[PDB]
Design a protein around this ligand. Structure first.
Ligand SMILES: *[C@@H]1O[C@H](CO)[C@@H](O[C@@H]2O[C@H](CO)[C@@H](O)[C@H](O)[C@H]2NC(C)=O)[C@H](O)[C@H]1NC(C)=O
Ligand SMILES: *[C@@H]1O[C@H](CO)[C@@H](O)[C@H](O)[C@H]1NC(C)=O
Ligand SMILES: *[C@@H]1O[C@H](CO)[C@@H](O)[C@H](O)[C@H]1NC(C)=O
Ligand SMILES: *[C@@H]1O[C@H](CO)[C@@H](O)[C@H](O)[C@H]1NC(C)=O
Ligand SMILES: *[C@@H]1O[C@H](CO)[C@@H](O)[C@H](O)[C@H]1NC(C)=O
Lengths: 229, 105, 226, 224, 128, 105, 105, 105
C-alpha cells in the first residue's frame, strides 16, 4: 500500500502552502512508476516532481507535492493519489478527504512564568504555555520573539490528551529554554495558538518579568533606641 | 577567599585550580559579571556550557587531592576577568574561591 | 455608460474569508435580456452570478456579477475581466482588474495609548487609540475584541492609510474606540488586532488595561522619638 | 457647463488673514479673452480679479475670480453673486454662496498625548498625538508651535473631521507630529494650538513635555 | 547519570478569573536513565489517579543522556481559599533519599508588598 | 449642602429639583456610587444618559427661577440612593446639592 | 564585545566592519552618546539616518561572510567616539560589537 | 558640540563665530560660569549686556551663511574662559556650540 498523508492543520498553517503528499512504502524498488493525483470532477492536476531516493533495504519510496487552493480542501472534496506499479497492476486509491463536522469549544490559553527557585540557580528559564480546552484535537503552538518565530527546534510541545471532566476537551503543553540572564535582561517570548475555532484562527498571550501586580514598599525605619523592641 | 591569580598566554590553554568540596553535588566555575550584582554560570556538573564558551571548556572531577580542574582552551580578550568557583544550587551564594585571569600578548 | 469593477479586497477576504469578485454596471436604462459573465486571465468558465441588485434611485438599471477565485492565481498579477453584453451597445463592455505587487513589505508597528486623565475627570466616556505606523502597502484591517467577543462595528471607527512624511511611500493609520469610564475604571483588556499581509502570521495584536503602569511606588517613614 | 464657487473656509481665513473667495469656471474649452467678475447682492462691483489660472493641457479651461472683502460682510448674512460670460455660453451665469445658517455651535475638547514607551524604547523617533473631539460644525484649524515659532507645515499630518460615533452632529479630528526622540528627551516643549469659531477667543493651546503626567514615586514621612 | 531536578508551579493569575477550576503543574527533568512517576498526595492521602495525568519521559531539547517529563492536576477554583498545598513527589534510583516531596500554597509565591521595619538600638547585643 | 429628600412611588415619575447656577455650562445629576469614592454621571448637558437610565430621564433648563428640573420616569429598587447634582468639568468636585431617593411599594 | 577600533584620516572615507547576525532583521550602528546612559541610532535597516549624518553614511548587507559593512564619507572632529553596532528593537540592549573612531590631522 | 577654540591678544578685539539657527528668536552668547552649575547671559537679542561687558561687546545677525558674529572689544584676564552660545528662553538648556578664550601677553 502507498501511504498518503492528509494535509494536517500544522501543515496548512505553517507555510500557508497547503499541498498533497503521498509516499510509497512497503513496496519494491522499480522504475516505470506513474505517481500523480486524481480529481473526482476530472480536472487536470499537476504531477508532483522531486522523486524520492531509493531505500538501501530494498524498498521503494516516491514523494512529491502539488499546489492547491485551501478552499477546495476546506469545502470537503476528496483527494486521491493514484500510484501504479509494474508488479502491482491494480491501482491503489488513497482517499484524502477531510472529515465533516467541527466541535464547538474554543481553546483557553494560559501562561506561567519560570520559578524563582530556578532563577537563583541561574541555569535556564523554562516558560510554559498551557493550551487547554480545544476541541477537536488539533492545535499548532509556535514561540516567536523580536518579530520572527524562534526556530521551533529550541522548544518542545506535547500531543492532545483527555480530561477527567466534561465531554469533549483536549489540553497541550510547551516548554522554551532560555538562559536566566537573557530572560532577566529583556525578551517577552510570546506564545501563539492556532486552532480552527478562533475568531481569526490565531490567538496569542505574552508574559515577562513585570507581568504581575506592582509591589509597594512600606519601609518603616526607626532610629530611636527607646522605640521598637 | 583564596586567589590563584592564575596567568596565561593568548592561545594555547590554561588550567583553573579550584577546591572540590564534599556533600555538595553541583560544582560550577561562575564568571563574576559584576554588572547588576549577578554572576552567570560558565560550566556546571548539571551540564550547562555557556554559548560563548561552547566547545572550549571542560570540567573533570576526581577526589584524589579534593580538587577539580577546569581547562579553558584558546583565549580571547573577553577571557580576562574573575571566575569565582563554588557549589550548591544557588550560584551567587557559593563562590568558595575567587580567581583572576588575563592575557599576555 | 461606465462599468465599475471591484477586484478582490483584503478587508473582505480577511473578514468573510469567502473571496468574491464583482463588477457592477451603471448608467444603463431599466431593460432586461442582459447577461453578465466573468472571465479569467485565460478566459475560462466561471460560476453563475446571484443576488441581482435593484435599479438606482435615478431610474437606471444596475446589476452585479459573482464568481470565485483563489489567492494562488490572483497573486500572480494576472488580469481578470467580466463580460457584459448590454442590449443598447453592440460592443460588449469589458473591464480588466489585476493584483499589483513590488511594493516594500515592512511589518506594521502597533502601539496602544491609554486615555488621558483630564478626559477621565468628567466621568462620561474615554477613548483608546491604536496607532499603526510604518507599513506598506495599504489594505490593512483593524477590529477590537473584548474577552473574545468582537465589538459591534457601530462603536469604533478607523482611519484610512496616508503617507509618512519621514518615510518614502510607507503608509500610516489610526483607530479609536469609546468605552464608558465606569466600565474602564473596573477592568477589561480591550485588544486591538491588525491584519496585514506582511506579518509572518498575517495577524498580530496588542492589549492594554488600566493597570499597565504604576512603577512600584514606595513609602518611607523616618520614625524617631515617636 | 460647470462653474464652481468655493466659499471661504475658516482654516484658510485663519491661516492667511486675507479672506478670499474663488469662482472657478470649468467644463469649457481653452478660450482666451474671458470676462469674469464678482458682484454683491445689490449689484455693486469689486476689485480686479488678478492671477487668472492657466489653461490645462487636457482640453479643459480654468479661471478664478477673487473678490477682496472683509469678514463681517461675509458673516453678516450678505449673499454674493458671480458673473460669468463666454462665447460658448453667452447667457449670463449666476451663483450664490453664503454661510449655512441654522446650525448649533459647540466648543471642542483638546487632549494631548505623549509618545508610547515602546516607541521610545527604539531610541530613534517619537510621535505626539493631538485629539480634538466634540466640535460642531466641521471647520477646525490645528497648528503646532515649538517655541512660539510654528514648525514646518510638512512635519505634521491632520485628519478631516469625521462624525463622532456616539454624538450626532458633533465631530472629531486628529493631528500627529513626528519629532526626533533625542529632542523630546532634552525637555523640548510642544503645544497644539487649535482654532475654532466657537472658542471664546477662537484660540486654544494645550502643551506637553517629557515630565507631563509622570507620577510621584517617593512618599517620605518625618514622624517625631 | 545526574540527580533528577524537579519543580512546581502555581495556577496562572489570569486563570483565576473565570471561576471554573485551576491547574497545578509539577515539572520533572533529568532522571537519567528515565525512571520516574509522580503521585499527587494531599495531607498524606494519595489522590485518585484520574486527576493527575503523567504522560511520558521526553528527551531534553539538547539531550546527551538527559530526559524530562511533565505532570499536571486539576482542582476546583473555590477550594483555593484554604490552599491544602496539594503536594507533589518524584521517585528515581539516582537519589539518596529516593523522595523529593515538593509542595506550594497560595501563601507561597510572589510577595505583592514588602513591609520592612528595621530598627536601630544600642541594647540589641543579646538579641533576647 | 441642602437635601430635598424627594420621595415617590414605584412606577409613575418623580421630579428632582436642583439649583441652576450661572458661569457654569455643564450641568449634571451625578449618582453617588460611594463604592471606591467615585460618582458616575447619570445625565449631562454634554448629552450622556447612562445605559441603565437610557430613555427614562430628561434634563430641562430654564433660568426663570434659577432652577433646572430633571424627571425620572418609571422606578426600580436600584432607583433608591443619592443623586448629588452640580456643575463643572470635574464631576466629583461639584455636587452642589445632595438628594435622596427611595421607593414606596 | 570585540573592538575593531578602526581608524582613519580627516576627509576621505572609513569603513566600519560589524557582524551580520541571523534571526534579527533590524541592524543598526548606534553611537554611544554616554551622556545620560542613552545611545542614539545613527543608521538602521528601518531607514533612519540622523540629520548630522544625512547624505554621508550608508549600510549594505550581504550574508556572504556574515558581515554587513557601513561606510562613513567625509570626517569631522565630532566623528571620533564609540559606535556600538547591534540588532533588535531595543537599541540600548543590543550593541553586539563596540568600536572606536578618531581623526588624524 | 563644536569648539572654535578662538584665540586672541591682550587689547584689540576678537570675533566669536557661532551658528545662527532658524525658528529660534532669542540668540545669546552665555558665559559658562561653571560655579554652581549656572550660566549667566553676557548678551542677548532681548537687549541685555552684562555690566562687566557694557559698552565692549556687540551682536550682529545676518542670515547670509546662517551665522551671527559677536565681537568683544578690549581684553582682560577675566576674558579667558568658556562662552557657550545658543538659543531659546532657557539659557542653560541651549549652548548649541562651546568655545574657549584666553589671553596672549
Ligand atoms: C540643603 O541641601 C541642599 C542640597 O545639597 C543645599 O543646597 C546647596 O547650597 C549650597 C550653598 O549652601 C550651594 O553651593 C549648592 O549649589 C546648593 N545645592 C544645589 C543643588 O543647588 C542647601 O544649602 C542645604 N541647606 C542648608 C541650610 O545648608
Ligand atoms: C503601611 O505601614 C503602616 C504601619 O505598619 C500600616 O498601618 C499600613 O497598613 C501599611 N500600608 C499598607 C498598604 O500595607
Ligand atoms: C505611608 O507611611 C505612613 C507613615 O508610616 C503611614 O502612616 C501610611 O499608612 C503609609 N501609607 C501606606 C499606603 O502604606
Ligand atoms: C503618602 O503619605 C501620607 C502621609 O504619611 C499618607 O497619608 C498617604 O496615604 C501616603 N500615600 C499613599 C498612596 O499611601
Ligand atoms: C507593617 O509593619 C508594621 C511594623 O511591624 C506593622 O505594625 C504593620 O501592621 C505592618 N503593616 C501590614 C499591612 O502588615
Amino acid at each position: 500500500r502507498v501511504f498518503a498523508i492528509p494535509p494536517s492543520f500544522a501543515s496548512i498553517f505553517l507555510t500557508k502552502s497547503t499541498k498533497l503528499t503521498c509516499l510509497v512504502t512497503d513496496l519494491t524498488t522499480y522504475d516505470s512508476v506513474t505517481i500523480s493525483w486524481t480529481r473526482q470532477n476530472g480536472e487536470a492536476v499537476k504531477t508532483h516532481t522531486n522523486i524520492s531516493e531509493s531505500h538501501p533495504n530494498a524498498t521503494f519510496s516516491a514523494v512529491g507535492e502539488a499546489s492547491i487552493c485551501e478552499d477546495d480542501w476546506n469545502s470537503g472534496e476528496r483527494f486521491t493519489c493514484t500510484v501504479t506499479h509494474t508488479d502491482l497492476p491494480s491501482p491503489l486509491k488513497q482517499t484524502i478527504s477531510r472529515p465533516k463536522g467541527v466541535a464547538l469549544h474554543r481553546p483557553d490559553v494560559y501562561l506561567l512564568p519560570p520559578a524563582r527557585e530556578q532563577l537563583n540557580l541561574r541555569e535556564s528559564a523554562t516558560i510554559t504555555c498551557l493550551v487547554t480546552g480545544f476541541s477537536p484535537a488539533d492545535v499548532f503552538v509556535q514561540w516567536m520573539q523580536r518579530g520572527q518565530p524562534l526556530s521551533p527546534e529550541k522548544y518542545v510541545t506535547s500531543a492532545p490528551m483527555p480530561e477527567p471532566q466534561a465531554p469533549g476537551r483536549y489540553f497541550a503543553h510547551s516548554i522554551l529554554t532560555v538562559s536566566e540572564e537573557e530572560w532577566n535582561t529583556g525578551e517577552t517570548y510570546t506564545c501563539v495558538v492556532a486552532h480552527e475555532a478562533l475568531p481569526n484562527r490565531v490567538t496569542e498571550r505574552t508574559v515577562d518579568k513585570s507581568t504581575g501586580k506592582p509591589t509597594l514598599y512600606n519601609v518603616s525605619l526607626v532610629m530611636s533606641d527607646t522605640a521598637g523592641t | 577567599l583564596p586567589e590563584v591569580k592564575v596567568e596565561g598566554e593568548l592561545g594555547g590553554s590554561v588550567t583553573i585550580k579550584c577546591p572540590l568540596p564534599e556533600m555538595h553535588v553541583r560544582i560550577y566555575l561562575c564568571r563574576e559579571m559584576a554588572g547588576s550584582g549577578t554572576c552567570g554560570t560558565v560550566v556546571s556538573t548539571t551540564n550547562f556550557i555557556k554559548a560563548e564558551y561552547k566547545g572550549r571548556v571542560t570540567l573533570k572531577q576526581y577526589p584524589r587531592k579534593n580538587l577539580f580542574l577546569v581547562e579553558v582552551t584558546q583565549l580571547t580578550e573577553s577571557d580576562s576577568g574573575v571566575y569565582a568557583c563554588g557549589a550548591g544550587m544557588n550560584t551567587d551564594r557559593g563562590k568558595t574561591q575567587k580567581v583572576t585571569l588575563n592575557v599576555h600578548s
